[PDB]
Amino acid sequence: MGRSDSAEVIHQVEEALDTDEKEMLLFLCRDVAIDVVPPNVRDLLDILRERGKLSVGDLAELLYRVRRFDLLKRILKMDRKAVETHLLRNPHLVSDYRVLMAEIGEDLDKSDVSSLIGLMKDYMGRGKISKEKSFLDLVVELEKLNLVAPDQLDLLEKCLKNIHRIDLKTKIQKYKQLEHHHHHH
């Protein structure tokens, strides 16, 4: 009741996403929802729609991060160039803090993840860190150590710079630059 046909669209994307990709959805919507969603991930999009915070464009952005060009053309009928135009204005449904982290992990390869860890041990001092854990996992892991903050990353930029990833460093600057303005002195 009130599920509308939009429920089906939501259901189709959940099935299409891999068990590995669905993790990104929770992470990205983690800020929006305190993981209040039951064990089933399908329910995650259900609560977003109810909140009315689920934008058609937002789904396209979410599909892009998981590197799914086929899904964009299948569900939202959006081509790859559409993503650049969409991101041209740099619009974000939720704080770019979560999206930035997901995007950064996407750009980094498996090899880079292992390399990034070596740098982390030097400052972490051999904390809870394993090569098995993905980049996304590493982001939340640092939160526990409070080595990074929403308005202060610093460490992230340094480690990425060492990996000779200037492009990633540039994206972080945009986030920090757009972190504050008239909102608070």
Q: Can you walk me through this structure?
A:
- The protein folds into two domains: 1-91, no CATH class; 92-185, no CATH class.
- It is globular and about 55 Å long.
- With 185 residues, the protein is an all-alpha fold.
- The relative contact order is 0.10.
- The protein contains eleven helices and no strands.
Chain-wise SSE layout:
Layout: H1 6-16, H2 22-28, H3 42-51, H4 56-65, H5 69-76, H6 80-88, H7 96-107, H8 110-124, H9 135-145, H10 155-162, H11 166-177
PDB class: apoptosis
Keywords: Apoptosis, c-FLIPS
Assembly: monomeric
What's this, in brief?
The protein is mainly alpha-helical and 185 residues long.
Helix content: 55-70%
- Secondary structural class: mainly alpha
Distance between the termini: 46 Å
Tell me the number of strands.
0
Q: What overall form do the CA principal axes indicate? A: globular
Instruction: Count helical runs.
Output: 11
β-strand percent reads under 5%
The ordered string of helix (H) and strand (E) elements is HHHHHHHHHHH
Rg result: 17 Å
What's the structural domain tally? 2
* Largest beta-sheet details: none
Features:
185 residues, mainly alpha, 2 domains
